[PDB]
Amino acid sequence: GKTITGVFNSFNSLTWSNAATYNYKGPGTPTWNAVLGWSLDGTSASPGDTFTLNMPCVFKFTTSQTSVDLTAHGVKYATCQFQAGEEFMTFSTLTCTVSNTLTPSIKALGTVTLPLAFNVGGTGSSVDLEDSKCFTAGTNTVTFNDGGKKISINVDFERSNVDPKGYLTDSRVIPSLNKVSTLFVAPQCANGYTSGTMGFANTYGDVQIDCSNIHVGITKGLNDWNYPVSSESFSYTKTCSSNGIFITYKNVPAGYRPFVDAYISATDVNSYTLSYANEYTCAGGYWQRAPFTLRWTGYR
Predict the structure, then answer these.
(1) Cα separations (Å) of 49 from 19, 63, 81, 114?
(2) What does the alpha-carbon distance between residue 11 and residue 82 come to, in Å, rounded to a whole number?
(3) d(CA 253, CA 179)
(4) Spatial contact of 258 and 217, defined as CB atoms under 8 Å apart
(5) Which among 58, 55, 49, 82 has a CA at the least distance from the CA of 68?
(6) CATH classification of 1-161 is 2.60.40.1280, yes or no?
(7) Where in the chain is the domain with CATH 2.60.40.1280?
(8) If you classify domain 162-300 with CATH, what class do you get?
């Protein structure tokens, strides 16, 4: 076939269905249902011809769905296959093939609903650090593009309901790998850190930390959803095993936050626990040791 463009021709609505009672209206909180208009005219396109919808800053679909049909009055005019950016790419793609129903004489139009979670960060990975600059709190334009034809809508996104000066955590499922990323950022020491020890563990067997997929770094502040925006070098020593990842660090400069992340896998991804080392001394002298445990039962 040949590549055609302009098939997706409108961004009709982008509406949040907060399906896990999240306390803030975040881009990376499920689900943002995107309703797009399309049209197919037998004068332009042919069976076999393909087209691609480019979706910047889209992490994944929120359902098990991997295919979406361009259907109109109960007849299917195109098959599309969704490819999620996850930790592979900053964008997601919908790749569509015109079906044998679009003969020369057919003129068709319809809509499609896409169940979205946007990527605004969550780890020290290259994909997340780049996508940490995707949106801001407040009004945002979301633009997809099929070829040169751009389709856009304005949406309002809410900064987190969590004080960024505290310790921070995150978890998000990577559906294709059946794996979960998890983040831990130390509490803020405004004028820098003399020392600290941080990390997380699960010593009970049913959760595995994957030491081949970790990040350790200092970030120069955080974005509007409390995720890292940079990952610089700093003085620390790491231990990692399937049971936990820990770092002891020193002399982090004012304005930075040390963080660690890792993929995890669990026998119940919808219900597992992690226990945290949370000890630090701020430059100036303010000391703290406040370990804790979390039950993870929502993931983004």
Answers:
(1) 37, 27, 14, 22
(2) 17
(3) 33
(4) yes
(5) 82
(6) yes
(7) 1-161
(8) mainly beta
